[PDB]
């Protein structure tokens, strides 16, 4: 069901499909990574693991969690360089928000802008669709915590607990069962789930060094990266 | 297919089936009744890789020093076959060193390198379901 | 870019436009939506359903009002949709700055129609996969218009975009008619969007925007479950 | 294999340029001669019908006072090179109040020979021969589409180029005299023409240090015909 | 072979065939050998002509008082990069009022030749450049390539069967750093004379020679200028 | 193995290949009589071919090196009469992208024009000659590069 | 108008007047010349107010973005460097009463001066504005090396008080800014 | 079929082969490794002698980008020199607007952004270069970064480029990162480079050692090979 250059460029197939973006959404899984986002009542938690093949690797350089603004954290997926370019575009555009409007960006409109930029990336036939995916958090006025996910289809969306990537499709199926029921959410409840879902998906049950936990809350509104110590505290806390 | 569509009681007979790709098998075989269960092999976890490495380290005489977590850290995404061929590659590389008992440093060298050659020839291991 | 800029859309042996046909197919695969223009004003009723109960419908809207008197819905692909919506949003303003007056529905469809037209023929870029249904109330008489990937436009008392739009189109042909009040238009719009809807319908499974001659209004899930409870 | 028109051959070199070298093989043939007395050049017009007006064909126009030139193959492609070269010489006369040497016009063309490309258009398919008198006297030059230049003594182009260069290097020497080279050249010309020789078939391009300009005219030519 | 279309494409082995075919464009030029001693630097080039009366086409061309160059390949890019070369010379020669150190100059050659080696619908330059010059550290003999990677040598050669000239180079080229200009020049033509098939000279007008020295300004030498250099030669064996 | 139905006309043949993988899988006795395989291109393969009983030691065979090229070519010319002046260095460097088989072709051409020359013994100009003969191809003309 | 910046051991101290007027008319009874560019770096401005606000907002932009990229606190010399750049660039167009000071994690308290010409220099203390004219001579001999934070606060209060007493432009009330590792502390004094 | 041509194009596997080809083309270059000690960073390069061919001390892949920052590159040489102009000018810009030494992280991030930016378009080609980057400061310490033709910028204590890579970085685990001083890592890397790369693969070669850190007071240059001359002394005796 394909004719012409449509597999090499961005146009519509006999059925209306375009192969580039569906090659991108599977161009995310090359990283072999796992992205987990959970939102609590007053807090929002991000957790991601990493792979350390060499002892020459610096644990501080391969960290996959990036702080865009004081109150705004983020996590990427897919290939790396695309993620970095996305990250400087993000930080850049936030700073332009503060310069133009003088107040802090809600970060939702940031997903809108980054999304539209991804659409411009899908449009031109002589440019590459840039298949990295983006997930964000933050705090807004009377909205509590929020989560949003920008994908390289030129769109954004954000929910309670969301995960996208290699093994994340089943982690949503575990998730919806964990979220409801009626489950209410504390901070250590959403951290604990942040470990569990990845566990039952992987079941490696391992050192706290490989995972990286990003967090935001309305107590300290600023984004924060957790130290391995307190992480291990939650780790022996979830093991009873 | 019509002998699994019986007209007959197949309770007493068992059937086990193995193939590369569960794609061309047609919906008739993919349909329960005829084929009730579906089970796959997956790439062994470093736990199971550890274990099969243990049982493959048994028959081979080794030097007093043995550390399996070296090979477990280094070997990732191999088949169980590729792992036992990695052990045999260690020993048959160690026939050059002519030592009877062989250190796991030679195993780290030959296992690591030749194993990564297997991973350069590992092209297109990604199969349907 | 590289300055190649050659229009990738040529004429078929019969003269038809391949990529525009395929974009029309992508719209046909869009979400089921409807709109009805009758009596007091226009009523637009779309369908937004979550692929998973994790999704939160309080976040993104399918209905994005251009001005207090003019709304808008769509079918097809949101990525393009949001884009051209930002475009028209910006575009009504220049008209305002000039005349200091709300831009008429007809004129919106004119200028956006031209943007989409040139956007087909533009250099080395696909057309949109979106077909818009625009509502508006001006000069006492409301209006309902429809766009297409090629930029052409029409006018309807009621219509549909998305899957089954021919079927539900014929349903709207017989049942809907004349001019009837917002309550009636909403009723039959919930019937016809209830046709292709899933087994369950909730306040968050759909969205209903209304164009009064007092001005456009976006209804909340509160009123959505109020009138539809008691569905149809 | 349609590739970028700028692509080298596997052997190799530019495709379209090496083909433009073949583009001249079919054009009108001409023969110039450099001799201490002066440069004499000659071409065959290759006329078809009585419709064809004989004076409307010129393969030779005098670029400057002391510089003549000949062409080959395509014509209106050469017109631009000719005119713009006249501009270059005249600007040389602007700055330096002298005569731009015959040798500097050469590179003043062949330096802009290949500018063609798409971004940042088609190469020229016309060969040229430069006659003229600088401070060292008579100079006959030869250039190609690719811009490669070499100075000759008696050079041929066109369809007859090969055998005319053979029989030419057969009949040449450095002690030549002007009319001797003229008639010796039109000997080869009347061996390489299909129609009988007349006043219309050819035109002569002649330049000498003090004999000028000249250029050349018919009815001198009409005498040189029967002078054979 | 469709992946050899333009420069942009990386081959399945990772080698752009455009630059390779440009190298093969360089190998067709007439052989020339540049060389230097601990003091003086010399380059020698052999002309080739189209016919008898057609002038033997020159190679060695002067650039700046302290820097001359040899050449092979397209005459177009030769005169072009030569003009850009005059520019570069009068640049520092203008602002700084000093000559140009060869090193940074040739890196400027690499930067100028770099961009066409990548952008879509562009070509490299067919180049047989051999550069000789004197900064405060004395002699230099460089060489270029269409890939824009330059080498610094005591003696190098390009063109047809110029590796045979190197097979003459290896032996005596430890001695080339010692002797003065004259016998160094006859060492040079002893390097070029094997690029000819053994049945023909090596005459006067068919060869071009250039020398530059520490206190000696770069000068081209041809015909009567090389007649002293061509005399006192022993003929090759049979 | 192609991809999907229909049809692989070799599906029976490659099926027999997977039967060789059964003789290497469900049955051990093939532990005797080692079977060696060779392929000019590794492009298409049964990805299951990776194993010690299956394809194990896998070696890329590169282009020979100028040392090895002049060595093996010297092994092809070692029987023939050669005038004792050959660099093997000159032509070893003159071997670029050559296959060792094209070094054989260099020898074979050396004998070929060695015939028409009438010379009873092979010479170096003959070597470089045959080199030019087989590689690289032809022809165009000498021009524009001066 | 009048501004004062002094570095003590653990950091720096800033203060300035409030009253900013145009000609004879009293425009704003209270106006703050200390602009919190970043948490640890302030600046005190004079001259045309719009130019100072615009430049300060622009270096707040570029600076904040740069430090967010650094993932590290910015340097005082880096903050003044951009003011030097933009000032010297437009030095024909604008006016610079800008003096910059702040505490740094690496170097502690530092002060930098940017006059109208666009040059940048670091001093033990800085002064600017039209009111400083009469206070040069007093503040020069009144100064003493090795000032603790208190002696700095009382010092600057005296200097600014005399300034606002004599010159007509400097007037209104006095705002003080104490910047150290413990964080920024401000207040407003009279008497 | 056509999916290998343009870097703008995806592939049925969701990646670009232009980057693969370019990558494995860098693998053909001579092995050049690097390592960082506690007081600095030790660069090392193996330059091959092919025929004679020409004068020693030419076209060395060791470059100097800044007063404290330099290059050790591998792969296509011209594009690497071009990247040396790039980073050179970038450090000139940081010096221009700010006036102190560029933190290595941002420099490598900019070069990574360019290298990434040339992988998205069929106008240019993916870069045929991969290089080592290292720097030292007292307010920073000894940092090393490794950049790939795809544009991923991270860091190591040591890394390996060129043909011999994994077998070369293997025994580098014996070199201790902190404990070992840099003057000793000179002869260490000397023994790695001399001991690796068997002499039959390339009949003759040489060793180049560049160095930056505390011993030279931040200045990055070649720790002179005639200084200490410890390679040959030790490396010749180290074959047994």
Swiss-Prot record, chain D:
GO terms for cellular component: cytoplasm; cytosol; extracellular exosome; extracellular region; ficolin-1-rich granule lumen; nucleoplasm; nucleus; proteasome complex. It is found in: Cytoplasm; Nucleus. GO terms for biological process: proteasome-mediated ubiquitin-dependent protein catabolic process. InterPro entries: Ntn_hydrolases_N, Proteasome_alpha, Proteasome_alpha-type, Proteasome_alpha_type_5, Proteasome_asu_N, Proteasome_sua/b. Induction: Up-regulated in colon cancer cell lines. Up-regulated in fetal Down syndrome (DS) brain (at protein level). May be the target of the transcriptional activator NFE2L2. The modification Phosphoserine is found at residues 9, 49, 56. NCBIfam families: PRK03996.1 (NF003075). This is Proteasome subunit alpha type-5. The gene is PSMA5.
Curated annotation (Swiss-Prot), chain E:
One of its GO terms (cellular component) is cytosol. The modification Phosphoserine is found at residues 107, 174. Induction: Induced in breast cancer tissue (at protein level). Up-regulated in liver tumor tissues. Keywords: Acetylation, Cytoplasm, Glycoprotein, Immunity, Isopeptide bond, Nucleus, Phosphoprotein, Proteasome, Ubl conjugation. One of its GO terms (molecular function) is lipopolysaccharide binding. GO terms for biological process: immune system process; negative regulation of inflammatory response to antigenic stimulus; proteasome-mediated ubiquitin-dependent protein catabolic process. SUPFAM superfamilies: N-terminal nucleophile aminohydrolases (Ntn hydrolases) (SSF56235). Glycans are attached at residue 107. InterPro entries: Ntn_hydrolases_N (IPR029055), Proteasome_alpha (IPR050115), Proteasome_alpha-type (IPR023332), Proteasome_alpha1 (IPR035144), Proteasome_asu_N (IPR000426), Proteasome_sua/b (IPR001353). It comes from the Eukaryota. The keyword Phosphoprotein applies. There is a cross-link at residues 112, 205 (Glycyl lysine isopeptide (Lys-Gly) (interchain with G-Cter in ubiquitin)). The keyword Transmembrane helix does not apply. It is found in: Cytoplasm; Nucleus. Belongs to the peptidase T1A family. The 26S proteasome consists of a 20S proteasome core and two 19S regulatory subunits. The 20S proteasome core is a barrel-shaped complex made of 28 subunits that are arranged in four stacked rings. The two outer rings are each formed by seven alpha subunits, and the two inner rings are formed by seven beta subunits. The proteolytic activity is exerted by three beta-subunits PSMB5, PSMB6 and PSMB7. Interacts with NOTCH3. Interacts with ZFAND1. PANTHER family: PROTEASOME SUBUNIT ALPHA/BETA (PTHR11599). This is Proteasome subunit alpha type-1.
Swiss-Prot record, chain F:
Sumoylated by UBE2I in response to MEKK1-mediated stimuli. Coiled coil: none annotated. It is found in: Cytoplasm; Nucleus. The modification Phosphoserine is found at residue 83. Belongs to the AAA ATPase family. Component of the 26S proteasome, a multiprotein complex involved in the ATP-dependent degradation of ubiquitinated proteins. This complex plays a key role in the maintenance of protein homeostasis by removing misfolded or damaged proteins, which could impair cellular functions, and by removing proteins whose functions are no longer required. Therefore, the proteasome participates in numerous cellular processes, including cell cycle progression, apoptosis, or DNA damage repair. Component of the 19S proteasome regulatory particle complex. The 26S proteasome consists of a 20S core particle (CP) and two 19S regulatory subunits (RP). The regulatory particle is made of a lid composed of 9 subunits, a base containing 6 ATPases including PSMC3 and few additional components. Interacts with PAAF1. (Microbial infection) Interacts with HIV-1 Tat. This is 26S proteasome regulatory subunit 6A. It comes from Homo sapiens. The chain holds residues 294 to 439 of 439 of the full protein.
UniProtKB/Swiss-Prot annotation, chain H:
It is found in: Cytoplasm; Nucleus. Keywords: Acetylation, Cytoplasm, Host-virus interaction, Nucleus, Phosphoprotein, Proteasome. Gene3D superfamilies: Glutamine Phosphoribosylpyrophosphate, subunit 1, domain 1 (3.60.20.10). GO terms for biological process: proteasome-mediated ubiquitin-dependent protein catabolic process. Its main location: cytoplasm. The keyword Cytoplasm applies. InterPro entries: Ntn_hydrolases_N (IPR029055), Proteasome_alpha (IPR050115), Proteasome_alpha-type (IPR023332), Proteasome_asu_N (IPR000426), Proteasome_sua/b (IPR001353). Induction: Down-regulated by antioxidants BO-653 and probucol. Up-regulated by bacterial lipopolysaccharides (LPS) and TNF. Coiled coil: none annotated. Pfam families: Proteasome, Proteasome_A_N. The modification N6-acetyllysine is found at residues 52, 201, 225. GO terms for molecular function: ubiquitin protein ligase binding. The modification Phosphoserine is found at residue 238. GO terms for cellular component: cytoplasm; cytosol; extracellular exosome; nucleoplasm; nucleus; proteasome complex; proteasome core complex; proteasome core complex, alpha-subunit complex. SMART domains: Proteasome_A_N. Belongs to the peptidase T1A family. Component of the 20S core proteasome complex involved in the proteolytic degradation of most intracellular proteins. This complex plays numerous essential roles within the cell by associating with different regulatory particles. Associated with two 19S regulatory particles, forms the 26S proteasome and thus participates in the ATP-dependent degradation of ubiquitinated proteins. This is Proteasome subunit alpha type-3. It comes from Homo sapiens (Human). The gene is PSMA3.
